[PDB]
A = this chain, B = another copy of it.
Amino acid sequence: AGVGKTVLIMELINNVAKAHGGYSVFAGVGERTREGNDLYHEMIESGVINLKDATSKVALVYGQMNEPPGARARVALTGLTVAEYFRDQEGQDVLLFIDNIFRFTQAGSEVSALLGRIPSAVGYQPTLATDMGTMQERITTTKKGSITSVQAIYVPADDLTDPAPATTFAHLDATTVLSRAIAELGIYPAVDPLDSTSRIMDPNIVGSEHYDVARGVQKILQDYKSLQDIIAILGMDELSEEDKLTVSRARKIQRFLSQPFQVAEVFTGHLGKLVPLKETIKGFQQILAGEYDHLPEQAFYMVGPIEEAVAKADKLA
């Protein structure tokens, strides 16, 4: 919370409809009745759901917290079923959202215990790994289409080696870490550029260019992080013609990484941007490059493609 989780889930939806003509499903596994109804009206107000026409881009499947173990156990499969249709019947690129993946596992244990089976390490089910695998594996790219799943993860005891979480990472290809700290910079989406990760960030997969830019953006962001301590204490100046550039750019970058969502137009009074991959790599490429070192920070705050960074500068004299 507070970090834009629901607005990010809703922009992804929209952007999947837009750029891939794919639809999305929402499975709330152990959802708080209060929070579902609030998710409902919030999608509605942002349009992803339309009660009047037939332009809804999401189907919602709910397994509320009052439901018995068995129900909160299966609802993620039900949601799965729905998504598999928009892939095996209409060969789209569906989006599957399981909120939250931990309550799936917990529902599993409750059911297990009820069937009188001996729990395994930490009290989970003996079948923890299979209960998960039989579900996770139905989420893939078949020849007909593909289901992509955004899974909200709860880590128990802040223990990443806890059997629930540990098992779960076996299947994850990437993490999207929403950060309250980043949000505080006003930066949104509040995704953390150094903590978020992906398996496919391999030049052998994204291509050297993509791979190098990305690795360029992060290092700079890392270096600046270092200096951050110095700046505040000993003051911003033993800073080199060099150390002063890494900062400048880094600060430009940090901003260029923020962006306006079309989902939040009814509210930000601003126009949403869906930047393209090509535009993304170029954008950052050039900042790294030094092409806009003359441009000012705020030129890059909340814009789409670099072109907008240029034009904002103009209006900012």
Contact = CB atoms under 8 A, between A and B. Distances in A.
The secondary-structure label for the interface of chain A is: helix
Interface string A159-171: 0000000000000
Contacts of A229: 233
A233 B239 CA distance: 11
Contacts of A238: 235
B235 A233 contact: no
A172 interface: no
Interface in A220-237: 229-230, 233-235
Contacts of A235: 238
Interface in A181-239: 229-230, 233-235, 238
A233 B232 CA distance: 10
Nearest to A232: B230
Contacts of A230: 233
A181 B238 CA distance: 28
Interface string A95-132: 00000000000000000000000000000000000000
A123 to B, nearest CB: 12
Contacts of A233: 229-230, 233-234
A238 to B, nearest CB: 7
Interface in A225-256: 229-230, 233-235, 238
A172 to B, nearest CB: 28
A240 to B, nearest CB: 12
Contacts of A234: 233-234
A234 B235 CA distance: 11
Nearest to A234: B233
In the A-B complex, the 6 residue pairs with the smallest Cβ-Cβ separation, listed nearest first, are A233-B233, A230-B233, A233-B234, A235-B238, A234-B234, A229-B233
6 contacts: A229-B233, A230-B233, A233-B233, A233-B234, A234-B234, A235-B238
